Amino acid sequence: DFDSLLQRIDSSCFFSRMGLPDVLDSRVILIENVEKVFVNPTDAEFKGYYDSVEWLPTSMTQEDPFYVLPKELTGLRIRVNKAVMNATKGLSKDKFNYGPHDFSLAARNGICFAFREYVSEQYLHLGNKWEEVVGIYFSGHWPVGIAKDKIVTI
């Protein structure tokens, strides 16, 4: 199953539909760009959820907001990390920058984190929280935040 995960990661178009108006799930709250999520946010665009939103991890040193890993799992994390890094090279920073800020490293660390924990999630049978998030990454978007049952995404 982890082999068909590698294939789907290897054929993905990560961050390719950012700002675009695809269909998407109910929990999703689409926001246009990095500017209007991180720099000049409006409570209207967040649909009243701004005060509850908490950024999904963008650093491997951050804690899991949802939930000793079997060394078998630990390795599956190394291998899916490498593969996610292979699928996220040379990203146009134009779409990840506003004024002095660049979010492409935050995004790359964030997609790597979400897939490592998705692997911990499906291996251990913890639940579907990261599955929700990884599904949005496969749809071509960046899930940046979580507000109650909702997921803020670009």
Binding site: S59, M60, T61, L69, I78, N81, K82, M85, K89, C112
Partner: protein, 384 residues
């Protein structure tokens, strides 16, 4: 057997603590002199071409090698030393904190590393005493290998030592073996620096005469290699490379079989006339160096305090580029979204000379205005 090295990476990642640690652990194990953090951190000022650079020079010895090691307090210092600094690094120790991971000066110091022609980079992953989980160390190693390979360094084959500069310096025998490991990789990974005497012949032309009956002679110092009498030689420079043969080599009236590296000689040629030799031309071993008009560079423009410009320049800037013996004019091309270069800046800069100079990647040069220096650069990529 002497090798130039030094420590690079972001502020606070442990370059100076590591430099300190290396000196004490090597002095304790193989002999030499321990150097304190204080004396290294509080670096004195160097002044090359009136450019100020805060720089500590340590020496340390492995059983097989002698190291001259540079360490600087600030990014600013490293920018100037890589572009302008006297001793070019034969290899660099990139220090990355396992805590912070790569930061903007981790990426900058690898980028400038490639641009300047630093041939080898080794990695000390520091503060591993503060980061217990190995997966984190493993994922940080993977962040670094991919950052290295992004700028054409062999990330897969890069030696990366997991260590602790502070704990090694404090005397903890556990973390001391990591410093010996690292120094080991200096000895094994960095090849013996390629000596000038063994490189292909090159002599910048500093004067020219026509000797009575004998023909054309060009004077100069031999930068590298050996020119023997009766060898083929090319005149690469301001015009189509000219083919000639060395008929003689005289040093102050005394005839020689060979002109060697470091020596000032007159080089007697065949057929070529006095009027075909030009300012900035070199003698070179045929097909070893080629003429270039356009190239990519990294440049540091001196501040006003360093006796540079008081005002900024624009795309329409048309300065003199002094390579070896003489100035040559050129138009510049700035990188995207940039239309201005202040005093004390450093930018990538695409240059087109109005006529070509023999150059490879890594050649140093100066930007000038009416005699006086206003910048210092290095050829990152020859073109055209």
């Amino acid at each position: 057997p002497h090798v130039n090295v030094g420590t690079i990476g972001h502020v606070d990642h442990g370059k100076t603590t590591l430099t300190a640690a290396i000196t004490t652990v090597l002095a304790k194990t193989y002999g030499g002199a321990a150097r304190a953090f204080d004396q290294i951190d509080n670096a004195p000022e160097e002044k090359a071409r009136g450019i100020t650079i805060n720089t500590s020079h340590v020496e340390y010895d492995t059983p097989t090698r002698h190291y001259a090691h540079v360490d600087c307090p600030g990014h600013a210092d490293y920018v100037k030393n890589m572009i302008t600094g006297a001793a070019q690094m034969d290899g660099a120790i990139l220090v990355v904190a396992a805590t912070d991971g790569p930061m903007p000066q981790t990426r900058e110091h690898i980028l400038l590393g490639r641009q300047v022609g630093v041939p080898y980079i080794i990695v000390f992953l520091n503060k591993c005493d503060m980061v217990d989980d190995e997966e984190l160390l493993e994922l940080v190693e993977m962040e670094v290998r991919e950052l290295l390979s992004q700028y054409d360094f062999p990330g897969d084959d890069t030696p990366i030592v997991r260590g602790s500069a502070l704990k090694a310096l404090e005397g903890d025998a556990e973390w001391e073996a990591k410093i010996l490991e690292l120094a080991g990789f200096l000895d094994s990974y960095i090849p013996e620096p390629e000596r000038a005497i063994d490189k292909p012949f090159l002599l910048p032309i500093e004067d020219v005469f026509s000797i009575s009956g004998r023909g054309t002679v060009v004077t100069g110092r031999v930068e590298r290699g050996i020119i023997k009498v009766g060898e083929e030689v090319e005149i690469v420079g301001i015009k189509e490379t000219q083919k000639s043969t060395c008929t003689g080599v005289e040093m102050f009236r005394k005839l020689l079989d060979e002109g060697r590296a470091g020596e000032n000689v007159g080089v007697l040629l065949r057929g070529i006339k006095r009027e075909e030799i030009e300012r900035g031309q070199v003698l070179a071993k045929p097909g070893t160096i080629k003429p270039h008009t356009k190239f990519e560079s990294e440049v540091y423009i001196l501040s006003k305090d360093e006796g540079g410009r008081h005002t900024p320049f624009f795309k329409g800037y048309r300065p003199q580029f002094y390579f070896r013996t003489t100035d040559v004019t050129g138009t510049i091309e700035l990188p995207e979204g940039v239309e201005m270069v202040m005093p004390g800046d450093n930018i990538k800069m695409v240059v087109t000379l109005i006529h070509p100079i023999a150059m490879d990647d890594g050649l140093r040069f100066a930007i000038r205005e009416g005699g006086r220096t206003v910048g210092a650069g290095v050829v990152a990529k020859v073109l055209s």
